[PDB]
Amino acid sequence: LSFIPDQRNNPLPILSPSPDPWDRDVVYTPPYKQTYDVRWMIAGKEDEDGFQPGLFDKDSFVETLGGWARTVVVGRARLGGIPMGVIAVETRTIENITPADPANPDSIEQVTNEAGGVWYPNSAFKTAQAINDFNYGEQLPLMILANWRGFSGGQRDMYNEVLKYGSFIVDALTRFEKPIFIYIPPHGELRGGSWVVVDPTINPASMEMYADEEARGGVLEPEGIIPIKYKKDKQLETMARLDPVYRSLKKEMAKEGLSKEESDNIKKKMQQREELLLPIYHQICVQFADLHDRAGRMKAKGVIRQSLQWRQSRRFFYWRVRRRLIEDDILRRIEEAINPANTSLAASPETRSPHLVQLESWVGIPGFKTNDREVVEWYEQNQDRINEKLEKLKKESIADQMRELXXXXXXXXXXXX
Amino acid sequence: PETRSPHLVQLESWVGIPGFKTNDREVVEWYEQNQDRINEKLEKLKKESIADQMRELLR
Amino acid sequence: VVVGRARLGGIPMGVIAVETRTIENITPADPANPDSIEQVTNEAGGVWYPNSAFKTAQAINDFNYGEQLPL
Amino acid sequence: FVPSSPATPVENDFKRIHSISDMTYLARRTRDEPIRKGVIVPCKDLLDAEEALSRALEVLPAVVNVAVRDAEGKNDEEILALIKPWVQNSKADLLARRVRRLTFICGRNDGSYPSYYTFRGPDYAEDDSIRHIEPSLAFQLELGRLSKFKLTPVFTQNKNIHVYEAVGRGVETDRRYFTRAVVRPGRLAEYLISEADRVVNDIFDALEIIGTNKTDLNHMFINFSHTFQVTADEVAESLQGFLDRFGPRGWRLRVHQVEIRINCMRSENDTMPLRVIITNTSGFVIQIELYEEKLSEKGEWVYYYVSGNAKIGSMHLLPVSTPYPTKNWLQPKRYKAHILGTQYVYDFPELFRQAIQNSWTEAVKKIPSLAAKQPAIGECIDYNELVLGDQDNLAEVSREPGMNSTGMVGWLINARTPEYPDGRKFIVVANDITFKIGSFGPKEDTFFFKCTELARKMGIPRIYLSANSGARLGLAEELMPHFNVAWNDPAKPEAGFKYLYLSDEAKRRFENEVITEEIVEDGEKRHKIITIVGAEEGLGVECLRGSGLIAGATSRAYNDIFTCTLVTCRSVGIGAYLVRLGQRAVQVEGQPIILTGAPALNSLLGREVYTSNLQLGGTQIMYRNGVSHLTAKDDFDGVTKIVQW
């Protein structure tokens, strides 16, 4: 209840930065080699050498449903005083052991390993449920630390309706009201089936997507694309180009003038050189394919707003969450004054509302779409000017509705009576 | 369901069949016959509601 | 639980009924785990089961959204 | 001497500059090519012309024209046997100077148009195609509309008209006579209507002497050089008049269609060119299609018709470079779909017509008397294709089957069902399994969305026919034979590589296709690749964005309009989800609803667990877990079952 607004459509129970200040850099950074407890990135990690805080306020995170589908972490936390909903992906291979059914004596406990960073029927259901919880009644801003590499394509998981619960994520995302921030963290991945169910084009009016500078995201893993787009023959065409030994041996076969016992030599010399170059030549294509799935490419194709540095994530989101929460409410109030009763791939949060163009000119700040800090400070100062412009628009809209009330001949009859 | 809508009391008096809540057959046959009479009274109410709507927009 | 669409003297509408006979769904063996065999389960008639309730809930949504059929 | 982009109505791909008469010069790039030189040799006599050839070539370190002034003797074949001895003699003289074209101008003092003879290529074999027409005149004649044919010209008494024997390059069964004519304006209102009668009679008389022979179809093109004030609405009324007189004669010659190109100043004033296609389909013309030549903003001149017809014709908003499709062209595609156990996308409208035909045939039995509202075999359904407009906004087109610009196709079908015998509409969207594995690209996504969006806006149901391969995969092919490697040790490359860089010369070539950082190693200006962008679309995130958009759209649509999907073939990745978001689904017995490939799972597990895509995607899984609502024996049985819904 400390995270929930006192009423229904009331602003969140926000306080000053006070214990954990907003102007602090995110100290805990996750390792790229092994697995890490994703919870440390949210609140902080308790270590032998001091304490490294997360991107939310120290000990403000409250994990829920932690006994079911631990492959996804759900909870509520505070960001410099601002309370909000959190969804993160567990990287470690968790194991849920289903109990033995006593009704059937031929039933034993089933040991099942829910491998980390993947979506399972139960994990997808958990995700879908959490979203509904954070929007209905609660009405909290959402932060998703996206790290899934797809869905569990296994026969058992498929038969267990993985597809049905996957859709329930998409359904729940269009239903959402308040701002949603999809942020791929450092080391975080977003491949194939995973990205689709979280893309900002689902609900552009409330979604906003960001990615870390050292995060990865493609249609498939760079190890998966190589046996389809950069096959053995494509690697050898590039081998007879970069390697000096292989292209020199290629010039021997092309020149001819060598017998059946002589042509066998060139074949047995190359098909030994190419066998030793193959492992490192393979890894080259892996690095090559990874450069497609880099953070820079994402901003270039406009699938994300900005590339983010994990260190100053807290500092950026504190003002962007605050800017969006005040703005969303002002825009909702603009429409309530105008009408007292999105359409393309181009639908980006800077074009989430058609009143943001009018609000832009009323504010008068050049870096309006950006400079989140400068925007927030302005609204607090010109509290009267916005309320003033709302009442201007309210009376202007009443004049339009009364004029529209065939309809003239009917009014001429209702007046003559 | 006999009290599923507050307009069923108004519609009841416009129809004029006593066994309105029951006699489902008799009700259906009446609407088909007086399809123009419904569209007549709906319009009478449409103009009526527009006149009140203007009072709400000033209040 | 039996789900479908039918006509009542020409009027089309959605139908949901309960099977009385004891039906048996046999879940296949998981090939990923060689220690998994097909599980014989008897869904006794005239009772609601997780899958039966889900079927009911899904059918209702189908008959209202887009379809817009009497139930 | 060329603009080859904002120039006269032509089609250009990437970076290329070609000639007017020579449609295929050098596409590579014109950044390194010698300037074209214009030469004109006026010679008094045909024999004396040889001295103005061998001496004429001496001032050449290209295009050469030769004018003749003897209006006295105009030979044919004898003129050809008088110009060939000079070209075979100087076969190395013309070759050394690297000149492409050799034109010949021969004018008459009685007002007769000059005769042209053009020699082209290495040996200069003389293309019989360009005759009695200028390089300028090679554009109006176009001949780029006959790329899918092997042309052999035939003799014409009138130098203005040219007839060609076109044969299908692939399949030989196609044999047609295509006529190409140019009307040049008379120097110094009922002029054009009478001018049309004279030129069409000349074509008719010429088609008569060569004979009708064996032609499946016959076409004639007439291009106007004069910009006489045309009021197409007056032209259309007058058109009806003379076509009914010439029509019978044209019907004997096996002529199926005629295309006129007139310029209208009444819009100096802007001259709006208006094309018109008159086809003799079903014995009676009833096809007066009045078009308008306008740019598609993509650099192509398209066919925008404001016809006198009911707008349910054929060909709409298509570039001016159409190749006139050959018969049996549809068959190779159909085969690519049929090997996968699915009907070719454009064969489905027919399947639906028969399923509606079937829906009546039983209703007439069950319900006697109430049957007379049946609209025959044909006219059962009234379909019209859907292709994205200029401003990404969908439009109703009735063009030829196939020729889909994207790997997704839609139709607006008005089926006269026994429930709504006056008509009922709906949208049908399907993936072309033959068009890039049926994979979802951004073009395919924007289309699928705009279709869902429309079905929603109109309240009519939407039907999706799934046969895809998830999202489009891809790598940058242009950077494969250009990128360099920086090793720890150059002698032994297996000792690990530091990074991947690009040569300065190869860096300037792209720059926007690859994000590169400069770091000097071994005293070299090495531009290390820090991120790959790639010129081509549909490789990574661009596909996922679009996939997410259509995923959400289907989720939204289901809650408003009637949504249905059909697994006509393997439905993978995003496609698999649109079947579930579409909620109501019909699965054809032998088609799987797979997420991750059967061998891809085996490679991941490191052991051969699954052996089939249907072992985890088939009916025995999806119908048994409730993803599939019904199972259909064949692709048609699917259609039939949805017709019932």
Residue numbers in the entry:
A (entry chain A): 1847 to 2187, 2196 to 2259, 2300 to 2311
B (entry chain B): 2203 to 2261
C (entry chain B): 1918 to 1988
D (entry chain B): 1133, 1153 to 1212, 1253 to 1379, 1386 to 1464, 1469 to 1846
What do the study's own words say?
Biotin-dependent acetyl-CoA carboxylases (ACCs) are essential enzymes that catalyse the ATP-dependent carboxylation of acetyl-CoA to malonyl-CoA. Eukaryotic ACCs, instead, are multienzymes, which integrate all functional components into a single polypeptide chain of ∼2,300 amino acids2. In addition to the canonical ACC components, eukaryotic ACCs contain two non-catalytic regions, the large central domain (CD) and the BC–CT interaction domain (BT). Here we provide the structure of Saccharomyces cerevisiae (Sce) ACC CD, intermediate- and low-resolution structures of human (Hsa) ACC CD and larger fragments of fungal ACC from Chaetomium thermophilum (Cth).
To improve crystallizability, we generated ΔBCCP variants of full-length ACC, which, based on SAXS analysis, preserve properties of intact ACC. For CthΔBCCP, crystals diffracting to 8.4 Å resolution were obtained. However, molecular replacement did not reveal a unique positioning of the BC domain. Owing to the limited resolution the discussion of structures of CthCD-CT and CthΔBCCP is restricted to the analysis of domain localization. However, MS analysis of CthCD-CT and CthΔBCCP constructs revealed between 60 and 70% phosphorylation of Ser1170 (corresponding to SceACC Ser1157). The CDN domain positioning relative to CDL/CDC1 is highly variable with three main orientations observed in the structures of SceCD and the larger CthACC fragments: CDN tilts, resulting in a displacement of its N terminus by 23 Å (observed in both protomers of CthCD-CT and one protomer of CthΔBCCP, denoted as CthCD-CT1/2 and CthΔBCCP1, respectively). In addition, CDN can rotate around hinges in the connection between CDN/CDL by 70° (observed in the second protomer of CthΔBCCP, denoted as CthΔBCCP2) and 160° (observed in SceCD) leading to displacement of the anchor site for the BCCP linker by up to 33 and 40 Å, respectively. Conformational variability in the CD thus contributes considerably to variations in the spacing between the BC and CT domains, and may extend to distance variations beyond the mobility range of the flexibly tethered BCCP. Comparison of flACC with our CthΔBCCP structure reveals the CDC2/CT hinge as a major contributor to conformational flexibility.
